[PDB]
């Protein structure tokens, strides 16, 4: 039996190149879907139909991407929009200038916002489709020392994601949240290493130290970029049809409340 | 691809004979599946081996459920504990007696109590396995003329659940909830029906009344039995092995907050 | 300016003897109120017309409460539900018995049911007064080791006072709940010199050892009785007059999500 | 007794021209503060020395008011952020333009994270102070038709204290959230009457049909803009001092989960 796929969907999925993006794409193409991803750059190995390059943290990125979608896609069924991250360097919230709070607010919540503003009517229009905001536990649980304005960027993405379920899910749009804690990428891994050219090493410890910062994990590991892929299939899925407004965390259980 | 599977997987599940129970216990058995379930008496058509005879709203019925599963299944890899209801009558907190309250936790709480109590250990021992707690939206969501008591049992649940995940998550069971709201069953739409010898009939017009009176289904239509086992499915299966500690709403957006 | 009084206001305080509970009763009789408290045996040095001897863990001992509040105080205003603890000792939750569960729900949950079935209906006939559930952190973020079943009582106790807020504030009775975080109590810093005859020393060290069993307290202290005291006799106050349906933490900043 | 003052306290409260700014400012004045509050232009009937002129939704309105702060309080002991609201027109979230967000985010957000930024490490040099952040009951129960970037804005600013609390509560100065549901003012109570030039006429019942756009009001009422003072007041006292990083909701019930 084959319980899930996403044969003749069209996925619109931002920040495809890397992590749970790249493995995301991965899994969607591998289920049947078409796929158009995002980058500033295409990544030399993979088709350039796959690609559109961009700066998704600038306006004029976002209108770019919208209309790629459009010529290459014709319409869309899925958008997942996985785009995020922080540059902000430590020191708590009043080392936060005004371009961090731009670029926290640009990367995290506005390319979806600029998006979805294009692509969704369409979708409202059929009467059919998906739209997945990704978003992270720090929008419940905000860690302080870098990542106060990602906090504050992602809890607004949150909410707006909530609101435009409310708007458009009696439409036949359904608006869900997937909501990572930390995963596991060629980044951390090294930030775990660095945290040993620091005191302590041994890597295990490094990852030890990380985890400790994010008041732990009981499931005592990150999450894999192929299990957040897994689950954004799943919600996109029609094994899904009932899901929607709804926020689902992968997290190995590092949110401490019920 | 073969996306999802369950085979190899002995599971456990309570009240499988009508409703999400049964379509879970389907489903399961779709999957691969080896399915124990329960009920006060056998319904006429699935074989014996299927299930156990047992009233686990008691604590006699706890403990031959438990022992049925140890000699059916030799061992359990997934607990689907699905037995929940509400027998109270209308007229508010004031008209709940010490004998509701004690229905209604015997039912919705107390039966996953005493069966994790004596299954879950063994599962830690193996160092595998899943519960999936099937809560409510009522527990964050509580309507107070017939399920007060409905509401704050499954909240207990919900809570309990929790707890239990920070325990055992780091021995490798995972432990997660699902919340669903409104399931289309033969007895709702029954109700639905009902509810039209008062003011009103069309039946669309019944399920208007009941969506109404939960603040609205963005949806606009209640959870399939189907719906709520595809997501069980998904939680019990290894695609969803980073997922612990949380709750899966399954409301077609009913719950309003974010 | 007299901010705030409770003059003229018949108020049930249950358990009362120490702790919070003695600091909110003596806060009440500053404020003007006329105090009703309970305990199983009455304190030597207290007025014999301030408190009624009972075990509120029993439906007697409700039964009991709820009559001689109606021959003192011939009404009440507001109800202030205070009585709660745990018993259990360690072992996570396969080490609950049924005793354990039950002695759980009947200190947490059932003192405060049982007394608002017979006392509330009085309440809502007048169309005033303010209930106010003294609930827990632990009701959002539990702890497994020994109160997994504190936990989920607490959790019942939230969601039933919510439940009961939507029935009864459009008839003028306001719901609230107060949640404390960890109260400091003779009990507590004997506590904390108890972990001292085990490793470390120095009570201060003892604290510290608490503290990080809860995940840390952003104010680096725990809540004191007066403290306590000061929120309920706000919340019950008519300063508070919009007020109701609400949880009201005061933990220090514990719970690590906002 | 004097239950509460805040004699000696000096209070930055932002945007005190009316509502509930208004009322804040009155009563901090009532129980002895030393008060400075802003406006874009200053009433007609109050002192001089109370107003400082700017337009907070600005970074130079906000750099004006932090100096402004320091040469007239010469240092503040309670910062109330009050400044919020939505200028958005209708049609949902696809009509919001980039000047809609850019405004709600100004309004609702950046003014809070400017003048703390300016304002709080001195606070925390000092090792004592209280911040409140007014947010908003839409930044859990997002209403759609014109406020979703509103409640998105409210939702950054909810995680935002959060975050800033985890940090600077340890260091003496606590951070809480207000979040207000309907406030009564003379805005409203016009808004009220203007949907009765609209099918009814009443203005009982043009109030009903805002209520009802909310989900109800269990209270059956908006909270006054006195009623909220009362809380921020409480809050900003010592007798709120192991209160921080949590937030507290005055809506007469409206939102319906626990
Ligand atoms: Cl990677
Ligand atoms: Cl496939
Ligand atoms: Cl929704
Ligand atoms: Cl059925
Ligand atoms: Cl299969
Ligand atoms: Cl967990
Ligand atoms: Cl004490
Ligand atoms: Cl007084
Ligand atoms: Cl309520
Ligand atoms: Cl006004
Ligand atoms: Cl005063
Ligand atoms: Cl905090
Ligand atoms: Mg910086
Ligand atoms: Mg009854
Ligand atoms: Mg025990
Ligand atoms: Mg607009």
Request: charge should be positive; proline fraction near 0%.
């Given at each position: 039996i084959e319980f899930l796929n996403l044969r003749?969907?069209?996925?619109?999925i931002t920040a495809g190149t890397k992590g749970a993006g790249a493995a995301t794409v991965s899994l969607?193409?591998?289920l049947g879907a078409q796929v158009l991803t995002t980058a500033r750059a295409r990544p030399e190995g993979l088709p350039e139909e796959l690609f559109v390059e961009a700066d998704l943290t600038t306006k004029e990125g976002c209108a770019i991407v919208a209309e790629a979608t459009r010529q290459r896609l014709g319409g869309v069924d899925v958008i997942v929009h996985m785009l995020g991250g922080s540059s902000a360097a430590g020191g708590g919230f009043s080392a936060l200038s005004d371009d961090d709070?731009?670029?926290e607010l640009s990367l995290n919540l506005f390319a979806a916002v600029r998006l979805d503003r294009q692509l969704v009517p369409d979708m409202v229009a059929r009467g059919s489709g998906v739209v997945v905001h990704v978003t992270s536990i720090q929008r419940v649980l905000p860690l302080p020392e870098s990542t106060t304005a990602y906090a504050a960027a992602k809890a607004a993405l949150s909410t707006?994601?909530?609101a435009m379920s409310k708007e458009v899910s009696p439409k036949g749009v359904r608006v869900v949240r997937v909501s990572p804690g930390w995963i596991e990428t060629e980044a951390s891994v090294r930030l775990?290493?660095?945290?040993?050219?620091?005191?302590?090493?041994?890597?295990?410890?490094?990852?030890?130290?990380?985890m400790d910062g994010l008041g732990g994990i009981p499931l005592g590991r990150p999450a894999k970029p192929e299990e957040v892929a897994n689950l954004i299939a799943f919600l996109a899925s029609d094994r899904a049809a009932s899901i929607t407004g709804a926020e689902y965390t992968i997290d190995g259980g590092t949110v401490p409340t019920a």
């Open positions: 003749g969907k069209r996925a619109l969607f193409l591998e709070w731009y670029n707006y994601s909530k775990a290493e660095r945290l040993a050219k620091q005191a302590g090493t041994d890597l295990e410890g490094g990852k030890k130290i990380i």
